[PDB]
Amino acid sequence: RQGKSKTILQHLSEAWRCWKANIPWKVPGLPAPIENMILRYVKSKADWWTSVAHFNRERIRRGATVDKTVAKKNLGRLTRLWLKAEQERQHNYLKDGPYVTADEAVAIYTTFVHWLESRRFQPIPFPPLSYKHDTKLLVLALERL
Amino acid sequence: XXXXXXXXXXXXXXXXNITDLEELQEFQGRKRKEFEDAIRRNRLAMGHWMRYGQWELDQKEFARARSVFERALDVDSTYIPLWLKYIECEMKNRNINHARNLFDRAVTQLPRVDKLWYKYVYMEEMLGNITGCRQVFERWLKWEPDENCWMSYIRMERRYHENERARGIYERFVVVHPEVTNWLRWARFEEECGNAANVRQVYLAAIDALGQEFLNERFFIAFAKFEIRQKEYERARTIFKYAIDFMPRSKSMELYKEYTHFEKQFXXXXXXXXXXXXXXXXXXXXXXXXXXXXXXXXXXXXXXX
Amino acid sequence: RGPPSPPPPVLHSPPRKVSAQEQQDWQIPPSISNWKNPKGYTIPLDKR
Amino acid sequence: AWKNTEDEILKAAVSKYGKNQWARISSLLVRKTPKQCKARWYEW
RNA sequence: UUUAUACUAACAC
RNA sequence: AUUCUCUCUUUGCCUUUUGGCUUAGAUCAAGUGUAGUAUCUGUA
C-alpha cells in the first residue's frame, strides 16, 4: 500500500526541525529501513546548511553583502551552530568528568590561600542591617539599570 | 475542569427541488463545471474521475459516461479500481458485447492481474455459453499462473459434465507445476469417475516423472488409503514394503505406523515387533543413561521376539 | 494537448507472496510535531 | 498566583498547539506571560 | 428608558 | 442445504494530520470617550 509515500515526509521534516533544535528524535516503531532513509537525507541538509553559514560569514567578514536578511539569517544559523556545540561541551564534561584533577586544584587553592594570608586579608562580610552605605549603593545599581 | 474545557467546545459547535426540462439542464450543467474543474486541479486522483462517470450514467448514459472512464484510463492505465468501476457501469445497463471487448483489453494490457481473470469468466457464466469460458481459461494457462487458476478451470468442467476434457486438463496442470499435491489431486477425479484401473496407472505415472528426490513420504500413504477402499490385501503389503526403503531416517516413523494400521485389519504379528523395535531404536538418546535406558527397551523387544 | 498513444502489455514477473506480518512490519505511525500542528486536531498529552 | 482555572486551560492549550509555542498560549491566558506560562509548565 | 455585541470608522485626540 | 436482510460479540482497512520553504519566517494584548444605525434580553 502507498499510503506512506506522502506520510514519510512529515517525519523527515520533523527530523530536520529536531536537528536544528538539537533535540534527539527517537520515534516509536517505524521501519528501521525508513529510520535510516531519513537519518541520511537529513545529514545531507545539515551540510548544505552548515556550509552556507561558513560561506556567508566570510562574505561579511570581508564586506560584500548587505541587507539585514542575509546578515540576519546567517546570524541565526550561527547562533544555532554554536549552541549545538556549547551543548556538547557541557554533556561531554559530566561524562568525561572534571578536567582539573584534584592534585592541580589542591595546589591552586593552597597557593591562593598563601597569597591572601600574605596580605593580612579580611574577608567580605554579609551586609549589616545597620549599614550607612547601602542606600547609596542601591541607587547606583538602579541608575545603572 | 480540564477534560470539560474540550467537550464543552464540541457540543457548542454541534448545536450551531428542480422543475421543468429547461431549469434542470442549468443545474446539470453547473455540476459538469464543478467536476471538470476538479480534474484540472488534479490530473490524477481517481476519486474525482470515478465519481464523474457514475454521475453521468444515472443522468444520461453512454457518451459522457463512456468517454470519461476512457479519458481517465489514459491518465493511469494500471489502476484496477477504475477498470472495474468502468465495467460494472456497462452491465448495470446490460450491454455485455460492449464490455467483453473492454474486458479483453485489460487482460491483454496486464496478465498478472488475477482480479481481472476471475472476473472475466464469472461474467461468462451469467452470460451463458461455456465454450467462451474455456478459450478464455485456456489463454490464461499459456501465462501458466497457479493452481488456483487451474482448479477454477476444472470446477467449470465438474459443475457441467464432459469429464474427458477435465482429465486432460488435469494432465496439463501436472506438467507445468509438477509437485506431489498435484498428482494426488489427479487421483481425486478418478475416485468420483469410479475407474479403479484408471486410478492405478495415474499413480504409476506420478512415480515416473518425480524420481527419488522429488517424491514425498505422504505420496505412498495417499496410495495406501485407496487400497483400503478396494480392500485389496495383495496391493497393500507390497506398496508399504517397497515405499519404506526410499525414506529411511528422513520420513520413517510416520510410514511404519500406517503399515501396522493395515496389519491391525489384516501368527502374523511379526512386523508388529519389527515396527516397535525400529521405533524404539529410532528414539534419539543423547547421553549415557538415556542410551542405556533405550538399551533396556530394545533388548526386551529383542528378547520377547 | 491531445491524448497519448495507447499503452502496451505490462508483462511483469509473477507477484511474490507477502504475508500479514510483512505488511504489518511496514506500519508507519503518523508523526506529530512539537511545533507545526496547524488546523485543530487536538492530541492528548500522553501521546507526546 | 496560578489558580486551577489557569492550569486546566493550559493543559488544553498544550494539547492543542504544542509545547514549542508559548506566546499563543499566554494570549489566551490574558494575565500570564509566555515566560511564566512556559516556566510554570516545566515545574508543575 | 436600561444593558451587551457588532456594524457603522471611509472619525478624533 | 444455499442465498438476501436485521442484531450482537471478536478481529482487519484507511484519509496523509488540515498542501510545501525560510531568521520557531517576524514581533507583543493600556486603549478610551461621544454620536447614529441593526439585532437580542428585561420593565342523542
Curated annotation (Swiss-Prot), chain A:
Compartment list: Nucleus
Source organism superkingdom: Eukaryota
Biological function: Involved in pre-mRNA splicing. May be involved in endoplasmic reticulum-associated protein degradation (ERAD) and required for growth at low and high temperatures. Required for pre-spliceosome formation, which is the first step of pre-mRNA splicing. This protein is associated with snRNP U5. Has a role in branch site-3' splice site selection. Associates with the branch site-3' splice 3'-exon region.
Subunit organization: Belongs to the 40S cdc5-associated complex (or cwf complex), a spliceosome sub-complex reminiscent of a late-stage spliceosome composed of the U2, U5 and U6 snRNAs and at least brr2, cdc5, cwf2/prp3, cwf3/syf1, cwf4/syf3, cwf5/ecm2, spp42/cwf6, cwf7/spf27, cwf8, cwf9, cwf10, cwf11, cwf12, prp45/cwf13, cwf14, cwf15, cwf16, cwf17, cwf18, cwf19, cwf20, cwf21, cwf22, cwf23, cwf24, cwf25, cwf26, cyp7/cwf27, cwf28, cwf29/ist3, lea1, msl1, prp5/cwf1, prp10, prp12/sap130, prp17, prp22, sap61, sap62, sap114, sap145, slu7, smb1, smd1, smd3, smf1, smg1 and syf2. Interacts with prp1.
Name of protein: Pre-mRNA-splicing factor spp42
Protein's organism: Schizosaccharomyces pombe (strain 972 / ATCC 24843) (Fission yeast)
Gene coding for it: spp42
Residues of the full protein shown: 725 to 869 of 2363
Curated annotation (Swiss-Prot), chain B:
Gene Ontology biological process terms from the UniProt entry: mRNA cis splicing, via spliceosome; mRNA splicing, via spliceosome; spliceosomal complex assembly
GO cellular component terms, A-Z: nucleus; post-mRNA release spliceosomal complex; Prp19 complex; spliceosomal complex; U2-type catalytic step 2 spliceosome; U2-type prespliceosome
Ranges: HAT repeats: 26-58, 60-92, 94-126, 128-159, 161-192, 194-229, 231-265
Signal peptide: none
Disulfide-bonded cysteines: none
Assigned keywords, A-Z: mRNA processing, mRNA splicing, Nucleus, Repeat, Spliceosome
Record's subcellular location: Nucleus
Highest taxon of the lineage: Eukaryota
Subunit structure: Belongs to the 40S cdc5-associated complex (or cwf complex), a spliceosome sub-complex reminiscent of a late-stage spliceosome composed of the U2, U5 and U6 snRNAs and at least brr2, cdc5, cwf2/prp3, cwf3/syf1, cwf4/syf3, cwf5/ecm2, spp42/cwf6, cwf7/spf27, cwf8, cwf9, cwf10, cwf11, cwf12, prp45/cwf13, cwf14, cwf15, cwf16, cwf17, cwf18, cwf19, cwf20, cwf21, cwf22, cwf23, cwf24, cwf25, cwf26, cyp7/cwf27, cwf28, cwf29/ist3, lea1, msl1, prp5/cwf1, prp10, prp12/sap130, prp17, prp22, sap61, sap62, sap114, sap145, slu7, smb1, smd1, smd3, smf1, smg1 and syf2.
Role this protein plays: Involved in pre-mRNA splicing and cell cycle progression. Required for the spliceosome assembly and initiation of the DNA replication.
Family from the record: Belongs to the crooked-neck family.
Name of the molecule in the record: Pre-mRNA-splicing factor cwf4
Organism of provenance: Schizosaccharomyces pombe (strain 972 / ATCC 24843) (Fission yeast)
Full protein segment contained here: 41 to 290 of 674
UniProtKB/Swiss-Prot annotation, chain C:
Biased composition, class Pro residues, residue ranges: 1-12
Localization terms from the record: Nucleus
Transmembrane segments: none
Modification sites for Phosphoserine: 5, 13
Subunit description: Homodimer. Interacts with cyp1 and the small 23 kDa subunit of the splicing factor U2AF (u2af23).
Function: Involved in pre-mRNA splicing.
Family from the record: Belongs to the SNW family.
Identification of the protein by name: Pre-mRNA-processing protein 45
Species of provenance: Schizosaccharomyces pombe (strain 972 / ATCC 24843)
Gene symbol of the encoding locus: prp45
Residues shown, of full length: 224 to 271 of 557
From Swiss-Prot, chain D:
DNA-binding region: 22-44
Subcellular location(s) of the protein: Nucleus
Residue ranges occupied by any HTH myb-type domain in the UniProt entry: 1-44
Domain of life: Eukaryota
Residues of the signal peptide: none
Protein family (similarity comment): Belongs to the CEF1 family.
Subunit structure: Belongs to the 40S cdc5-associated complex (or cwf complex), a spliceosome sub-complex reminiscent of a late-stage spliceosome composed of the U2, U5 and U6 snRNAs and at least brr2, cdc5, cwf2/prp3, cwf3/syf1, cwf4/syf3, cwf5/ecm2, spp42/cwf6, cwf7/spf27, cwf8, cwf9, cwf10, cwf11, cwf12, prp45/cwf13, cwf14, cwf15, cwf16, cwf17, cwf18, cwf19, cwf20, cwf21, cwf22, cwf23, cwf24, cwf25, cwf26, cyp7/cwf27, cwf28, cwf29/ist3, lea1, msl1, prp5/cwf1, prp10, prp12/sap130, prp17, prp22, sap61, sap62, sap114, sap145, slu7, smb1, smd1, smd3, smf1, smg1 and syf2. Interacts with sde2.
Function: Involved in mRNA splicing and cell cycle control.
Listed name of the protein: Pre-mRNA-splicing factor cdc5
Organism: Schizosaccharomyces pombe (strain 972 / ATCC 24843) (Fission yeast)
Shown part of the complete sequence: 8 to 51 of 757
